[model samples]
Target: MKFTNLTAKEFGAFTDSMPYSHFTQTVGHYELKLAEGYETHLVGIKNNNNEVIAACLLTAVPVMKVFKYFYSNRGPVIDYENQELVHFFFNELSKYVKKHRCLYLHIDPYLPYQYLNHDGEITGNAGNDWFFDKMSNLGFEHTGFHKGFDPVLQIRYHSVLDLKDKTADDIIKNMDGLRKRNTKKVKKNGVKVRFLSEEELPIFRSFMDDKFYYNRLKYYKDRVLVPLAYINFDEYIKELNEERDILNKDLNKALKDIEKRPENKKAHNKRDNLQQQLDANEQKIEEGKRLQEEHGNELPISAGFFFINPFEVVYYAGGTSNAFRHFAGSYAVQWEMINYALNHGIDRYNFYGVSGKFTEDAEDAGVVKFKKGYNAEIIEYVGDFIKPINKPVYAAYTAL
Candidate 1:
């Protein structure tokens, strides 16, 4: 097999046919990074008949004036199980990096290390040991399996929903009770989530910017109106108001029933329950009002950008407007995207990253809880690995 630098057209063709492709390993991503000042290179291995066997899109950024390091995000798009193919690909990759004056080559393949349930219990190991051994045997240094979302270029843990051969009703039935109830409540309140038009992308971008700004100020401020936080407050406030009104009417009815049948234990219990609801409503109402005073009337709620591929739709990024958080607009947006993918016959809905910690006390447990509410299958990747092309430079750079 011969290693070659592929042209744009050749790279696209090779990648499109690869088994383990990801958006980050695409030409578009390469061009995007290239425009951002990083250099992009597409390398491939070809057989005797000149058929491309494996390929990757590598992005290099200078560590110093003369030294640089390369990264292939969630790549080299090749069959990991095929030892010969993987071995040849890396053998050529090492030479290519050395020729290019690269200090090291870092890779974090999109291959699954383990399939996990919502609770983080491993259901299957996904043959991780084989891949780990193969890479290690090739002189690649192993990066340990990290638990939380830290010390990695890409997310190691992810939440993914398999929508293949499932109906919309089936999907909803699989979700947790809280998510189903919240989704129904949001709909009953007439809060709707729809796709933004081309004109509205800027609006979504603006919400993201606000979210980022508030995130930085979160530690300093007593009350930070994060876009999602504020939005949730608004939704919860609306729900509380409705509940209060309903409870008041019920309480009055219970009082009348108790007057007519003073001996009835059911009426007495009903009245007590209604009073408890009313008390909770009062506290919630105050909290809601405080949030409103802090955040104002703008209700952006939730926004997301889903990138469509042939087999899956990836939920890329976006955050809540904090103004419509209680309306459960994020759930609505997710459902909308999932249904859109379903309608188009997509098999997978990639809900993206989580902390991989399922324990309630974990720092990022909220992320795991929220995503798991959608009844997604948690996945852990093989993690990052690095092979030093120029060890002296690599060692010096690591020390610095």
Candidate 2:
């Protein structure tokens, strides 16, 4: 086998023909990176008959004037378990990177390492240790078994639903009761989920901004400030106001009785506690208002990006208006996306990114829980790897 740089059409033909190619491995994705000023190359290995065997889209970024860092996200677009193929591919890849003066090559393959249950426990093994060890032996530095979503190029864990030979009702029947009920509510309310064109990306961005802002506020309230032990913001604020009113009424009575009764020390303590709570609540409300002013806009209550690929449809990014969250509009959006994928004959619906440590204490545990309600299979990928192309430059790049 020999490696060669492929033309745009040749690269597309090779990548699209793969059984398990990711969107990142496509020419369009490479073009996007090119638009961002990153240099891209479409390299492929061809057999003696000149048939393309393995291919990848490598993007190089200049770290310094002298050296660059390269990456192939979710790819090499080859069967990773095939040792001979992987070995030949990387051997050629090394020469190509060195010619470009790259510091290292980073890759996080889209292949599954293990099948996990909803609880994050490994239910079945994909026997990926051999492939991982082979890659390590072939000079790729394994990034180790990371648990959470941090420090990884792509999510190690995902929630994916197989839609092969399944109707919409068949898929919905497997969903958790809450999701089923919420979906019904969305339908009953006449909530429609429409796919937005590229021009409508701003609308989706607005929803994402709201989602991010609301999450940030919750982080402050739950972890930084006092733990709010209520269901929703309005309810919590109302409870605070009621408590404040009662404290004011009691303080008035206490002040009036102080001269007659001469002592009401418990009332003074109660008043102090009530004042502190009121102060905290006031700060929370102010922060909420600030978030609203920053992120609030006329956008859909539910919006998300659905990435359409040959094998699967990915729920890439999503958000719902916190005010209309009770309306369950997001449920309709998900259902519509899933139905669209199935109708298009796509075999999988990828609800991407869940914390590998699916425990309640994990920061994204709620996200994992929500995706799990769709009854999707939990997939854990082989994590990131880095192969150094130039030792001195790589060391300097790491240090700097």
Candidate 3:
């Protein structure tokens, strides 16, 4: 077996082929988008035939501080069960760490988790299970566990229902009271929902600029949003709003037209259809409102990141419009996303990273409160466990 560094093009080719690839790992485009500030690298382990087995995507630490660590989100695509491949990958990893003069490497591998079918059955995450034992044997210290919905992990504690296994009705019937009621309430309240495409970047960019100004006033910075994450999220929000606005307008027009017609079966059905569409819209609007409420103190949709890998989708960062919090936009968006994930064939719906262990009064208590409402679990992970590259330097640096 051979371990080799992957070029930008080669790394993308393989990861794109995986059904459950993660956007973070595949985000080489960030380098191009941001020019020179951000750095990215890829590594792969291949068999003698030169077939790639395992791999990882790495983002360099933003600040060249006294202590440096290259962060690797859920990654390393080697045969998790093959000890040899795991060994090969780590050997390369160690080399990379040394070359970069990194204090250590932090990786959040995809956990061994699976989704439950509608039949109330559990399924195995075969891919993830393949690597755990071997990786552990390689002496990578575990970071414990992550808590709540981590942007880096699946968003919620409980996995979302794999929609492939059940009908929409079956899925709805199984939701917790809060989820169901909220979905309905948004519908009844005339909130609007919108599907967004990549075209709405300008609007989002403007809004993001507004947010940037806001953050500066507060003298705070969202490091990821500093044009480095390579996500044109500001545009996404504007585009989503534009789509929502269009959909809502169409639904209202249809409703009006139906109201003018005679009270016949056709009219009734048309009205019902319009009503259904409007209800969905309301659900979306309410979700936006909830998100606003949830992150009232933070940034807006562009305030965080949301992306996907074939196995899981991630909602990394979240901020809501403080002015719109009463509408509960942030909460609504998050809940709908959670509901959406459950209905998919995915295994875990992690709520990414949390502040730390849940001592009722932790600083992140508010976020924990919102996440728990969806029946999310408090999962702890081995956090950025590092293998020291230079002990004296590392220890001295960390002490500072």
Sorted on lDDT, highest at the top, how do the candidates line up? 1, 2, 3
Instruction: Choose 1 or 2, whichever is better by TM-score.
Output: 2
Tens digits of lDDT, candidate 3, 1-400: 6767877667767775664455555644334323435466778876777766667787666333644577676676555555666677776787877787687666765444444322223444434444445556655655444544455444323323234455545544655686656555544332333323234323234333344333322221111221111112234345456766776777676667666875566766766776676667566656556554665522333223344444555555556555645444554555455455566544445555555445666757666555555444443222334466676776776688
Best by TM-score: 2
Residue-pair clash count for candidate 2: 0
lDDT of each: 0.74, 0.73, 0.52
Residue-level lDDT tens digits of model 2 in 1-400: 8888888787778877776688777766766566657788899898899888888898888876878888887788887667888888887888888898888889887778899987978889887678787778878898887877575467788888989889989888998999888877776543455545444555666675444323322322211111100123344345556666776776677666665655678766665765676677667556545544665522256776655667777777777778768758778778877877788778889888887887789898777788888889898888889998777777877798
Instruction: Between candidates 1 and 3, name the one with more favorable TM-score.
Output: 1
Off-target runs (Cα >4 Å) in candidate 3 are 16-21, 28-36, 61-69, 99-103, 112-164, 195-305, 319-350, 354-380
Whose lDDT is greatest here?
A: 1
The alpha-carbon deviation from the true structure for residue 252 of candidate 1, after best TM-score superposition, in angstroms, is 25
lDDT per residue (tens digit) for residues 125-150 in model 1: 88757888878888788778876767
Backbone clash numbers for all candidates listed: 13, 0, 66
Model 3: how far residue 344 lies from native, Å: 8.1
Higher-lDDT candidate of 1 and 3: 1
Residue 90 error, candidate 3, Å? 0.9
